[PDB]
């Protein structure tokens, strides 16, 4: 896939792990 | 089931003084009826006629004039000055590449206190022997030219209203005094007053208006 959408893919992904991890802070 | 054509009052338009044919054209109105009339309602329109149609001579093909109607007298409605334009084609044909264009303008008053903003444009010409293919001036050049043009324009206006200014523009003396004070800075070609618009006229004064009429 186009680099930039992949960069967008993983931005999304980090915000998700960033979320799930806060459930346990 | 009407056809306003079998109902419309008809008319003819007369130019003012300092031109050629005062006879200008024709118009349609609406019978001066009790409640809404051919008089007060309109008449006071405007007409754009190329002064070459209005002076005859063709060394005047461009340059359009606004004639506004102010007063009326039975199948005979007069007009006064309302502005001047150029033609789009002439202008579009002075703006060649490889040369500097220069414009300047000022808002300024007359005697019969019309208030107007007049325009001015000129282009750097090649020196008749010059080898380099463009010829531009030097901003410092440009700045000075506009200040002198601006100087000359503020001078020439506040003559006897548009009337004499009108009389001033038609033989284009303005265009030449410019070139004269200018040629000591930088060449230049064309050089016209291009445009002049009216934005604040005084008060009717049926007298002075009638002074261009006979």
């Amino acid at each position: 896939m186009r680099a930039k959408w992949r960069k967008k893919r993983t931005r999304r992904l980090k915000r998700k792990r960033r979320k799930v991890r806060a459930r346990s802070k | 089931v009407v056809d306003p054509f079998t109902r419309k009052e008809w008319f003819d338009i007369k130019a003012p003084s300092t031109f050629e044919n005062r006879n200008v054209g024709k118009t349609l109105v609406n019978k001066s009826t009790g409640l809404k009339s051919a008089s007060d309602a309109l008449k006071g329109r405007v007409v754009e006629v190329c002064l070459a149609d209005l002076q005859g001579s063709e060394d005047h093909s461009f340059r359009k004039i606004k004639l506004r109607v102010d007063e009326v007298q039975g199948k005979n409605l007069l007009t006064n000055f309302h502005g001047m334009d150029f033609t789009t084609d002439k202008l579009r044909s002075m703006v060649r590449k490889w040369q500097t264009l220069i414009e300047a303008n000022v808002t300024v008053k007359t005697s019969d206190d019309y208030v107007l903003r007049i325009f001015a444009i000129a282009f750097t010409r090649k020196q008749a022997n010059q080898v380099k293919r463009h010829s531009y001036a030097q901003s410092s050049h440009i700045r000075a030219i506009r200040k002198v043009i601006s100087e000359i324009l503020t001078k020439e206006v506040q003559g006897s209203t548009l009337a004499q200014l009108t009389s001033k523009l038609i033989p284009e003396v303005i265009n030449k005094e410019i070139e004269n004070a200018t040629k000591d800075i930088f060449p230049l070609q064309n050089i016209h007053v291009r445009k002049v618009k009216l934005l604040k006229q005084p008060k009717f004064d049926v007298g002075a208006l009638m002074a261009l009429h006979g």
């Binding site: - | 093909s61 084609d89 579009r92 044909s93």
Partner: protein, 97 residues
């Protein structure tokens, strides 16, 4: 690799020009990369000119052309206007006709 020294087109000593809008598809394109034509043409045409003067007051009149600049966008410039696509060497040639 690199395919031109003018890169896209004509910009050395600046950094940023200013976009124009393509006359055909409205695509923004930098002014120096533009690709331009002066559309100068008579108001009338090949046929109407005789019929013009004929049904006119004035001796032959004067006649005024229309002068307007065109800004195309490469894609629009290629798809019809000035384009061909030139061989490796012909591309170098900046002469017009």
């Amino acid at each position: 690799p690199k395919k031109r020294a003018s890169n896209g087109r004509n910009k050395k000593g600046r950094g940023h020009v200013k976009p124009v809008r393509c006359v055909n598809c409205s695509k923004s394109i930098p002014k120096d990369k533009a690709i331009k034509r002066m559309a100068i043409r008579n108001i009338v045409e090949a046929a109407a000119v005789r019929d013009l003067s004929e049904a006119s007051v004035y001796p032959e009149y004067a006649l005024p052309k229309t002068y307007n600049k065109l800004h195309y966008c490469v894609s629009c410039a290629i798809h019809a206007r000035i384009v061909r696509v030139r061989s490796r060497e012909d591309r170098k040639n900046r002469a017009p006709p």
